[PDB]
């Protein structure tokens, strides 16, 4: 402490943090950079931003911060404020709504050889193109491009500490699993600086979403309502409640469209899987409503005003039922005429009832075929939209 | 005081607050770490973060800040701005918002023997992994990990604050008690480094049990009521023409209450909350009520001439099942032209009687099936609700902060 | 300003003023710091966050004998404006903030008078913890506090006291929050009923603890319920009471259960709204929440009753037997008790087929008449049950609603700020020393 | 030993960053400006705020900071903290969040010859008033206004940077190595203009600034898939109420009012996406209000048709004029015991005849209702189709004008 | 510029930023204050807070910051960090959730005569009491009271630069039109400081809301549903859909009322006319529902349960239809003996059923007449109620 006080006084007597810390200006400052991911705070899909808690370990040698421990009581390593010394100016290129550079200036560990290890913390808010093509079963390849802003590769060289980010202290996420993580070094020529390539290290993270929450809270209700859609065709017309069921299902699916459209970004690069399913099921419900209205209109066909066409009697009464229950004194004379009139009226009523029953039978055969077709279409559409991705995810091991 | 000024001038001549106090190389500064909880501000499930207001209690020794009181007019202690002295770089490692430091640096109290006591206030947002399985009847285990950010265990040693109480200190009179969380256990532990750059930690644990009254009032009871109405759908006669409306509006109201829950539940995917499981169970029950009401309406409205009742349906749903369900079914041109008309009318009415008998038989089958479904729904609802409620109620907080597993 | 340039140079450079040392002759002495609070605006009370936002001016007054001068020596200057970072400060903070903002917002100049008095009146936006009592919402009153203390100094180094005013040469303490008419804006939702100020010394705490002393300014505030009344309570109450019309709807209409369940849906939406306006605490159910739960339970009962009435209405001889006891009870006894409206050889063989036919016709019409009459009797039984359920359900709902809302209508803050203490802490009652 | 330290001491030992680099007070410092857009982050319609990520490159001459490589070991560039040199203090004047300056205070690069370059990064949140008329087929004109916060035009002036060929870059620069395309907003144009004003004698010293104009086109595929198509389909469902029976169990009024409710829900759906301003109504809003009015009229139509269809003789008399108009004109435009028993049988027959005549009047009422339903269906379909077609054809002709500038992004 | 460096070194050799900048301490520092409104960022009605972007121009002479340009190479003006000099300590009294004082310390322009112009920017989040009476056709009056905090009028005097705020650089608002703006100087004695008045300048902005958004998104759907509530009275009872329509309308209006509740502050100083419209129309719909239930009950009455009161017949069948359009129509074998008796039984049964049907038709006619009278009552009541609520404010705006 007395020894270290004397050492610290000596080291910064004539020190400069402006110049690069090399004996000769023609040399390159060799910086080792290693990213440690502590926590994946958030993946905002709507705003396409990833929030992470990181430690940006930076190692380099300062030529002018060496000493002999024998002259200072054997002190071999010290901790000093980072603001006093030259540091590399690492910037996150793809910063979205956070800070470009480190702002938390923690201490550096300085060895007697001049080696410096500075491990600042950071909250990175980085851009990420969110591909929603398979949401909620989607995989996101995000990145963190880090580089010295003002120093080109000929004066400061950054090298990755490791091929991969350090996940040894990573906190497990309840929403995402990091499948793969890599760190690649790149040299890039920018139009601003034609002849001086600048270096960067890009850390890539491939992450798979855990889909349980969205399955339970979104998909299952939609499946329930879309299954209820097909049941209008088994519900009798005389119930007077076909429209109630179908229209209430439609309104519920609209209210769920609200949630689903707030859950995704408004980009046009691709239509999401959940969006495709919602549009398909809305069109499914609307077709069911239209066909149900047609069926109801067929069921209530007045035999007096409407006459059964021959093609209807051939298609729905003769052919389809085979494919798929049963087919198809003045006073005394005036009183006698009255009894005869009553009998004739009963005859006319019976014939009218039979014609109405024929119309109702046609409507019901339509209902049976439609129940079968709509249950098959619902099941097969759901599978055609989901199984393609689910099989792939099950295959991915 | 002029004497205090002279003592302060003496103490800080040649003093470097950036240099750790160590009379010899290899000496370690022993730092006692305690925590006083002034308020548990919140536990945000969505962000998975515990917000607390606390006072740290940091104690160490700085040999450079010692003096003889007799030589300085009997002054035995000093209050000095914390920026003027070396501080241990103690930070909340597991903070969730990027803030590592204390809210206000205030002053240290230095005794004449070099003992430094520092009690800074701190408003902290710490990461807490929310166990969602039994929410809102859940208990949480929210740690606050304190450690030196820079110095290793060979330079600065840590110990739990105790003089021995290994617990977060809560003052009974002045503690702002949360209206949603009860504190069950509040221990503190020193964690040795894993096994040089190695470091110790001091972790303060808060075991907290939620008070679930709100969720019992705003979610559970309405769900029970809607479930009870979904049951009573099966007692509604088919001829009323209201089964579909009742069941469907029950499902829609359940959707409204799911929208209510959507603002409160956690968003993780490691498990499903028990209240969400109960909501999904209820939604499936009402959906099946809709399905079975459609089936009953189909049976009731079955046209008698277009359908012939299968003999097996007759035996099952008219002879055997009603006994089990306690359903008892109750029970001369003029003259010739007149005779023919009268006989035709009688024949038509006999045909109507036969048609009505078949209609009533189909409707009785519908009634029997409705009663069967009513009893089945009562049994299934009661059993599932009882199972879920007993699972929720028997979930209790730990009796020991560190169970043996 | 040649003169006060000279004065500042004399006070701070010549005399060697040290702002880190307290203004005391001896270390054992304590500095008296008088404190007052002036409320310029009660900005908000966020119930969900349980936070009070206020705009205040914190008056600090103390003595620094190192900053005295003879005004005649310095051009008759009697007052100086100085930056607060040049002089020693008591370092008073808001202890019970809930956002980490302990200090005043704007560090304005101190005013130093020639007799050594330092006067500092900074403004502040303070965000403080106010636990909310929800029991009587929207007819609730709240009890917020603003606790001020020093973390840099204890009761051994500074002594907190309340500001003292004078009336007719008689000094009295200012034991309340000051409301300056030139600087106060009334809150549209919250009326200040009591505004006391108190010096609290913990007798059990040690003198060298920062928790030994504090000064607390309390605000007992009554909510103005007219907004909530008109916009929430009258709609919800009217819609809930509207459910009783189902008992007067005929069973043949086919819309009783629709009306009842629609009322239930409306009550659920109201519950959804009001749940977002209050914290999810477990200490009590809000009064509005109590009424809503009562109404939803009653409406669920009404829906079940509608189901039962519909079931009774549609019974026929082919499925049910109408017992004579039920007939007597529900068609004679209850209707008069409830005061319901009430009704009131060759030729032979040749024509034998027609006679047998006509007898069969007659038996058919007679049986149909009897069947229809039994159906009508079931309808009348359903009407009687509906009337009885009306007379039972409507008074119960009215009485329960009246009880629940009369709990809140007659809820008032206490006559005194502190129970057990007769003092009012009002400027009308100055407790002269 | 380091030549950088010698050069730094030689340049900065007697240097004042507070004073402009001019030999005379009346001289002007010329600043060459370039703005590189790396990411159009977002356009927040509700806040009317454009968020962008840019590099603000400024170049100028500081004669005090001139050196030769030959005198300093061949050094041709020196990185220096920006706080140690004079800067022109360029700010975004039209920021909305109070953030005038750049995000990261990067080093300046001092080249031999007195040339000073500064290329800091920045996240800017600028004011952009949103023209809502043709949403979601809209295009926006979001300006970025840059000026010196401290100096007037006579003290500091702006010029655009030049490319290799000596051509002025009077636009937002795009580097392909550091550009990210926004998924919702294409950048059609980005001209830059240097404006000078307030040069009048009464005005006093002149003022200048640089304004870039991002003309950006929304990519509307998302809103077409998720909002417009469902809204159009559920709005077209209102016409189905005309084909339902006008009986007790027909549910005409059920289907119509519930379609109106769905339209209201869609109004709420588009409320949470559009700006909150009142200079114009968005096209989607106009379409929704139009179809809501149509659905209200159709609800009234269903009520009228139900009223007409269910009339019966016991409470109504057959309006002959309405019958002629609807059923004729519209289709063309398109012993004691013996005597007592005889009396009884006659009463049966007469009652049967009366029931038949009453039933013939009820059938006529139902037929009139059907004819009204058909004609009203055709009228409503024509109105709905015409209005929707006009409203969306308003969007069809909305396009970025043919401006005389080069495209922002080279293909 | 070496001349400027030498000048700045000379000016601050023995300068004090604590001391007021006039030659003798008995003089008052004269400050000219002007406010430039660049943008009205937001008006938060619920929290009653107005966010504006402003430039707070402040002009004053510093006695100790003068020089002769001929001694410094013609330098006649310089740019100085504002932190280095004395400044007036202007504070926004009615700050709500912003800063009390300026925090952006931009440079000052200093002339050789000693004149200083300082034009710092700020974002003011000020308190404004929101008058909800005429919302969404409301006019607000939002003030910014700015004054030196610690200096009383006897040591520092502030004067308005202009009578009105400077709106030359004002950005157009999509929600508000500034009808009027005016700056007033005040001298106020506060209870904290008797016998020393403190000065302030209050800039008030009278701003009218642009109501098109709330007309499109709130008022029009409300009017549509409030027009639909009355079509229930033209619906037949036998349609079985009166309750459906009326209850749907009531639910929609209730949902919209709660949206309006979320749109306004929860104060009790006044009741909004839009809220009064919503409560009155919902009470009217509930009255319509009650009367509809009564009408349906009346329509289903039969001799099997009730008997027509004479008063009901007199009122609804004789008097009311007179004021109507008159579109409504106001031989020993036992088998043989059994057969004849049965024929007589059938005839009498049909006669009794006809009589019962006629009584039921009378009840149905009474229900129909009540339905017509209520339809007309709805037309006039709803039309004049909507007019009575809105036309007042609309005519008031038109008259302006």
Swiss-Prot record, chain B:
SUPFAM superfamilies: Neurotransmitter-gated ion-channel transmembrane pore, Nicotinic receptor ligand binding domain-like. It catalyses: K(+)(in) = K(+)(out); Na(+)(in) = Na(+)(out). Its main location: membrane. It is found in: Postsynaptic cell membrane; Cell membrane. It comes from the Eukaryota. It is a multi-pass membrane protein. Residues 1-211 are extracellular. Disulfide bonds join 128-142. InterPro entries: Neur_chan_lig-bd (IPR006202), Neur_chan_lig-bd_sf (IPR036734), Neur_channel (IPR006201), Neuro-gated_channel_TM_sf (IPR036719), Neuro_actylchol_rec (IPR038050), Neurotrans-gated_channel_TM (IPR006029), Neurotransmitter_ion_chnl_CS (IPR018000), Nicotinic_acetylcholine_rcpt (IPR002394). GO terms for cellular component: acetylcholine-gated channel complex; neuromuscular junction; neuron projection; plasma membrane; postsynaptic specialization membrane; synapse. Pfam families: Neur_chan_LBD, Neur_chan_memb. GO terms for biological process: acetylcholine receptor signaling pathway; behavioral response to nicotine; chemical synaptic transmission; membrane depolarization; monoatomic cation transport; monoatomic ion transmembrane transport; muscle cell development; muscle contraction. Glycans are attached at residue 141. Pentamer of two alpha chains, and one each of the beta, delta, and gamma (in immature muscle) or epsilon (in mature muscle) chains. The muscle heteropentamer composed of alpha-1, beta-1, delta, epsilon subunits interacts with the alpha-conotoxin ImII. This is Acetylcholine receptor subunit beta. The gene is CHRNB1.
UniProtKB/Swiss-Prot annotation, chain C:
Gene3D superfamilies: Neurotransmitter-gated ion-channel ligand-binding domain, Neurotransmitter-gated ion-channel transmembrane domain. Keywords: Cell membrane, Congenital myasthenic syndrome, Disease variant, Disulfide bond, Glycoprotein, Ion channel, Ion transport, Ligand-gated ion channel, Membrane, Phosphoprotein, Postsynaptic cell membrane, Receptor, Signal, Synapse, Transmembrane, Transmembrane helix, Transport. GO terms for biological process: acetylcholine receptor signaling pathway; chemical synaptic transmission; membrane depolarization; monoatomic ion transmembrane transport; muscle contraction; musculoskeletal movement; neuromuscular process; signal transduction. Changing residue 268 to F: In CMS3A; delayed closure of AchR ion channels, increasing the propensity for open-channel block, as well as a reduced rate of channel opening. Disulfide bonds join 130-144. CDD domains: LGIC_ECD_nAChR_D, LGIC_TM_nAChR. The chain crosses the membrane at residues 225-249, 257-278, 291-312, 388-406. It comes from the Eukaryota. Glycans are attached at residues 76, 143. Changing residue 58 to K: In CMS3B; prevents expression of the AChR on the cell surface; is a null mutation. Its main location: membrane. It is found in: Postsynaptic cell membrane; Cell membrane. GO terms for cellular component: acetylcholine-gated channel complex; neuromuscular junction; neuron projection; plasma membrane; postsynaptic membrane; postsynaptic specialization membrane; synapse. The keyword Transmembrane applies. NCBIfam families: LIC. PANTHER family: NEUROTRANSMITTER GATED ION CHANNEL. This is Acetylcholine receptor subunit delta.
Curated annotation (Swiss-Prot), chain D:
Coiled coil: none annotated. Changing residue 78 to P: In CMS4A; rare example of recessive inheritance. The chain crosses the membrane at residues 220-244, 253-271, 287-308, 375-398. Residues 245-252 are cytoplasmic. It catalyses: K(+)(in) = K(+)(out); Na(+)(in) = Na(+)(out). Residues 1-219, 272-286, 399-411 are extracellular. Changing residue 221 to F: In CMS4A; mild form with variable penetrance. One of its GO terms (cellular component) is neuron projection. Its main location: membrane. Changing residue 245 to L: In CMS4C; prolongs burst open duration 2-fold by slowing the rate of channel closing. PROSITE patterns: NEUROTR_ION_CHANNEL. Disulfide bonds join 128-142. It is linked to The muscle AChR is the major target antigen in the autoimmune disease myasthenia gravis. Myasthenia gravis is characterized by sporadic muscular fatigability and weakness, occurring chiefly in muscles innervated by cranial nerves, and characteristically improved by cholinesterase-inhibiting drugs. After binding acetylcholine, the AChR responds by an extensive change in conformation that affects all subunits and leads to opening of an ion-conducting channel across the plasma membrane. This is Acetylcholine receptor subunit epsilon. The lineage of its organism: Eukaryota, Metazoa, Chordata, Craniata, Vertebrata.
Curated annotation (Swiss-Prot), chain E:
Glycans are attached at residue 141. GO terms for molecular function: acetylcholine binding; acetylcholine receptor activity; acetylcholine-gated monoatomic cation-selective channel activity; transmitter-gated monoatomic ion channel activity involved in regulation of postsynaptic membrane potential. It is found in: Postsynaptic cell membrane; Cell membrane. PROSITE patterns: NEUROTR_ION_CHANNEL (PS00236). It is a multi-pass membrane protein. Pfam families: Neur_chan_LBD, Neur_chan_memb. Residues 234-244, 298-371 are cytoplasmic. The chain crosses the membrane at residues 213-233, 245-265, 277-297, 372-392. The keyword Zinc does not apply. Keywords: Cell membrane, Congenital myasthenic syndrome, Disease variant, Disulfide bond, Glycoprotein, Ion channel, Ion transport, Ligand-gated ion channel, Membrane, Postsynaptic cell membrane, Receptor, Signal, Synapse, Transmembrane, Transmembrane helix, Transport. One of its GO terms (biological process) is neuromuscular synaptic transmission. GO terms for cellular component: acetylcholine-gated channel complex; cell surface; neuromuscular junction; neuron projection; plasma membrane; postsynaptic membrane; postsynaptic specialization membrane; synapse. Disulfide bonds join 128-142, 192-193. This is Acetylcholine receptor subunit alpha. It comes from Homo sapiens.
């Amino acid at each position: 402490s007395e020894h270290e006080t004397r050492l610290v006084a000596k080291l910064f007597k004539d020190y400069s943090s402006v110049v690069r810390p090399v004996e000769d200006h023609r040399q390159v400052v060799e910086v080792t950079v290693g990213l440690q991911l502590i926590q994946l705070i958030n993946v905002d899909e709507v705003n396409q931003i990833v929030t992470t808690n990181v430690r940006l370990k930076q190692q380099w040698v300062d030529y002018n911060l060496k000493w002999n421990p024998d002259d200072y009581g054997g002190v071999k390593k010290i901790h000093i404020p980072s603001e006093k010394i030259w540091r590399p100016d690492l910037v996150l290129y793809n910063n979205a709504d956070g800070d470009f550079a480190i702002v938390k200036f923690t201490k550096v560990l300085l060895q007697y050889t001049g080696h410096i290890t500075w491990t600042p913390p950071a909250i990175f808010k980085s851009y990420c193109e969110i591909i929603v093509t398979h949401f909620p079963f989607d995989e996101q390849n995000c990145s963190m491009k880090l580089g010295t802003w003002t120093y080109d590769g000929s004066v400061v060289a950054i090298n990755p500490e490791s091929d991969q980010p350090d996940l040894s202290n990573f906190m497990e996420s309840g929403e995402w699993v990091i499948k793969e993580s890599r760190g690649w070094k790149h040299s890039v020529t920018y139009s601003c600086c034609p002849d001086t390539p600048y270096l960067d290290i890009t850390y890539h993270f491939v992450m798979q979403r855990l889909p349980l929450y969205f399955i339970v809270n979104v998909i299952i209700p939609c499946l329930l309502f879309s299954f209820l859609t097909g049941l209008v065709f088994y519900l009798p017309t005389d119930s007077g409640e076909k429209m109630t069921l179908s229209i209430s299902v439609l309104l519920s699916l609209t209210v769920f469209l609200l949630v689903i459209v707030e859950l995704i970004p408004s980009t046009s690069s691709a239509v999401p899987l959940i969006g495709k399913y919602m549009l398909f099921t809305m069109v499914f419900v609307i077709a069911s409503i239209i066909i149900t209205v047609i069926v109801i209109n067929t069921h209530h066909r007045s035999p007096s005003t409407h006459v059964m066409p021959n093609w209807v009697r051939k298609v729905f009464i003769d052919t389809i039922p085979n494919i798929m229950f049963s087919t198809m004194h003045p006073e005394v004379k005036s009183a006698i005429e009255g009894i005869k009139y009553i009998a004739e009226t009963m005859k006319s009523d019976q014939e009218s009832n039979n014609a109405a029953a024929e119309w109702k039978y046609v409507a019901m055969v339509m209902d049976h075929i439609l129940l079968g077709v709509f249950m098959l279409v619902c099941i097969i559409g759901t599978l055609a939209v989901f199984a393609g991705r689910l099989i792939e995810l099950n295959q991915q091991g | 005081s002029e004497a205090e000024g002279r003592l302060r001038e003496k103490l800080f001549s040649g003093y470097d607050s950036s240099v750790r106090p160590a009379r010899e190389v290899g000496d370690r500064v022993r730092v006692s770490v305690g925590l006083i909880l002034a308020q548990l501000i919140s536990l945000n499930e969505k962000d998975e973060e515990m917000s607390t207001k606390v006072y740290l209690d940091l104690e160490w020794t700085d040999y450079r800040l010692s003096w003889d009181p007799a030589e300085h007019d009997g002054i035995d202690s000093l209050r000095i701005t914390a920026e003027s002295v070396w501080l241990p770089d103690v930070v909340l490692l597991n903070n969730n918002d990027g803030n590592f430091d204390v809210a206000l640096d205030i002053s240290v109290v230095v005794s004449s023997d070099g003992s430094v006591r520092w009690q800074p206030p701190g408003i902290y947002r710490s990461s807490c992994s929310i166990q969602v399985t039994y929410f809102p009847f859940d208990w949480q285990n929210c740690t606050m990990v304190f450690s030196s950010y820079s110095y290793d265990s060979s330079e600065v040693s840590l110990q739990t604050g105790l003089g021995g109480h290994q617990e977060i200190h809560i003052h009974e009179g002045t503690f702002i008690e949360n209206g949603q969380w009860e504190i069950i256990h509040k221990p503190s532990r020193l964690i040795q480094p894993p096994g040089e750059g190695q470091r110790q930690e001091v972790i303060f644990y808060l075991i907290i049990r939620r008070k679930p009254l709100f969720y019992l009032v705003n979610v559970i009871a309405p769900c029970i009521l809607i479930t009870l109405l979904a049951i009573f759908v099966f007692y509604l006669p088919p001829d009323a023409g209201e089964k579909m409306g009742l069941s469907i509006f029950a499902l829609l109201t359940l959707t409204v209450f799911l929208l209510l829950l959507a603002d409160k539940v956690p968003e993780t995917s490691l498990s499903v909350p028990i209240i969400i499981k109960y909501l999904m169970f209820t939604m499936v029950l009402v959906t099946f009520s809709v399905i079975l009401s459609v089936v009953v309406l189909n049976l009731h409205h079955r046209s008698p001439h277009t359908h012939q009742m299968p003999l097996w349906v007759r035996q099952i749903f008219i002879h055997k099942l009603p006994l089990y369900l306690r359903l008892k079914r109750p029970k001369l041109p003029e003259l010739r032209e007149v005779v023919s008309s009268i006989s035709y009318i009688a024949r038509q009415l006999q045909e109507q009687e036969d048609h009505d008998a078949l209609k009533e038989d189909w409707q009785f089958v519908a009634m029997v099936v409705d009663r069967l479904f009513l009893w089945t729904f009562i049994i299934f609802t009661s059993v599932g609700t009882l199972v879920i409620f007993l699972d929720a109620t028997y979930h209790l907080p730990p009796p020991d902060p560190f169970p043996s597993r | 300003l040649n003169e006060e340039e000279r004065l500042i140079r004399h006070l701070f450079q010549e005399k060697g003023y040290n702002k880190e040392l307290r203004p005391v002759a001896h270390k054992e002495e304590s500095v008296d710091v008088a404190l007052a609070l002036t409320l310029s605006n009660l900005i908000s009370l966020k119930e969900v966050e349980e936070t009070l936002t206020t705009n205040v001016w914190i008056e600090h007054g103390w003595t620094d004998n190192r900053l005295k001068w003879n005004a005649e020596e310095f051009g008759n200057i009697s007052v100086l404006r100085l930056p607060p970072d040049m002089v020693w400060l008591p370092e008073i903070v808001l202890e019970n903030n809930n956002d980490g903002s302990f200090q005043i917002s704007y560090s304005c100049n101190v005013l130093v008078y020639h007799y050594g008095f330092v006067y500092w009146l900074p403004p502040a936006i303070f965000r403080s913890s106010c636990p909310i009592s929800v029991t009587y919402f929207p007819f609730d009153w709240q009890n917020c506090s603003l606790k001020f203390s020093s973390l840099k100094y204890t009761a051994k180094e500074i002594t907190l006291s309340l500001k003292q005013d004078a009336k007719e040469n008689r000094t009295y303490p200012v034991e309340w929050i000051i409301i300056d008419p030139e600087g106060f804006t009334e809150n549209g939702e919250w009326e200040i009923v009591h505004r006391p100020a108190r010096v609290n010394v913990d007798p059990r705490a040690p003198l060298d603890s920062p928790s030994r002393q504090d000064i607390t300014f309390y605000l007992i505030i009554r909510r103005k319920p007219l907004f909530y009344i008109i916009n929430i309570l009258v709609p919800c109450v009217l819609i809930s009471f509207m459910v009783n019309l189902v008992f007067y709807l005929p069973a043949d209409s086919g819309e009783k259960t629709s009306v009842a369940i629609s009322v239930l849906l409306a009550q659920s939406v109201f519950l959804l709204l009001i749940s977002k306006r209050l914290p999810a605490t477990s200490m009590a159910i809000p009064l509005i929440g109590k009424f809503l739960l009562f109404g939803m339970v009653l409406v669920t009962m009404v829906v079940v009753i509608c189901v039962i009435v519909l079931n009774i209405h549609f019974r026929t001889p082919s499925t049910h037997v109408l017992s004579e006891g039920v007939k007597k009870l529900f068609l004679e006894t209850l209707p008069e008790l409830l005061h319901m409206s009430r009704p009131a050889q060759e030729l032979f063989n040749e024509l034998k087929p027609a006679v047998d036919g006509a007898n069969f016709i007659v038996n058919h019409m007679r049986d149909q008449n009897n069947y229809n009459e039994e159906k009508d009797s079931w309808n009348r039984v359903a009407r009687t049950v509906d009337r009885l359920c009306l007379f039972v359900v409507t008074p119960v709902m009215v009485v329960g609603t009246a009880w629940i809302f009369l709990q809140g209508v007659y809820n008032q803050p206490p006559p005194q700020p502190f129970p057990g203490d007769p003092y009012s802490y009002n400027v009308q009652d100055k407790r002269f020393i | 030993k380091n030549e950088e330290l010698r050069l730094y001491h030689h340049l900065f030992n007697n240097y004042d960053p507070g004073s402009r680099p001019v030999r005379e007070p009346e001289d002007t410092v010329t600043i060459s400006l370039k703005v590189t857009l790396t990411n159009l982050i977002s356009l927040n319609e509700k806040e009317e705020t454009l968020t962008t990520s840019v590099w603000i490159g400024i170049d100028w001459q500081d004669y005090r900071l001139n050196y030769s490589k030959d005198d300093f070991g061949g050094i041709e560039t020196l990185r220096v903290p920006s706080e140690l040199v004079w800067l022109p203090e360029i700010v975004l004047e039209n920021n909305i969040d109070g953030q005038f300056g750049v995000a990261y205070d990067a080093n300046v690069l001092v080249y031999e010859g007195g040339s000073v370059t500064w290329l800091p990064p920045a996240i800017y949140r600028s004011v952009c008033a949103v023209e809502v008329t043709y949403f979601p087929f809209d295009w926006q004109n979001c300006s970025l206004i840059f000026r010196s916060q401290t100096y007037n035009a006579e003290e500091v002036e702006f010029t655009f940077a030049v490319d290799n060929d000596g051509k002025t870059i009077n636009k937002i620069d795009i580097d392909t190595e550091a550009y990210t395309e926004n998924g919702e907003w294409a950048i059609d144009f980005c001209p830059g203009v240097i404006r000078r004003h307030h040069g009048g004698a009464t005005d006093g010293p002149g003022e200048t600034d640089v304004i870039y104009s991002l003309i950006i086109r929304r990519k509307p595929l998302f809103y077409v898939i998720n909002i417009i198509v469902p809204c159009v389909l559920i709005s077209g469902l209102v016409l189905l109420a005309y084909f339902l029976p006008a009986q007790a169990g027909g549910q005409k009024c059920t289907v119509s009012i519930n379609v109106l409710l769905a339209q209201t829900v869609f109004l709420f759906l588009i409320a949470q996406k559009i700006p909150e301003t009142s200079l114009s109504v968005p096209l989607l809003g106009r379409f929704l209000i139009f179809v809501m009015v149509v659905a209200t009229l159709i609800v009234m139509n269903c009520v009228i048709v139900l009223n007409v269809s269910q009339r019966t003789p016991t409470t109504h008399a057959m309006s002959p004029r309405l019958r002629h108009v609807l059923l004729e004109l519209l289709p063309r435009l398109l012993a004691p015991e013996v005597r007592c028993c005889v009396d009884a049988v006659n009463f049966v027959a007469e009652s049967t005849r009366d029931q038949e005549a009453t039933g013939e009047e009820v059938s006529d009422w139902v037929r009139m209702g059907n004819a009204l339903d058909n004609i009203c269906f055709w009228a409503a379909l024509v109105l709905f189709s015409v209005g929707s077609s006009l409203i969306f054809l308003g969007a069809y002709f909305n396009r970025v004008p043919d401006l005389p500038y080069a495209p922002c992004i080279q293909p």
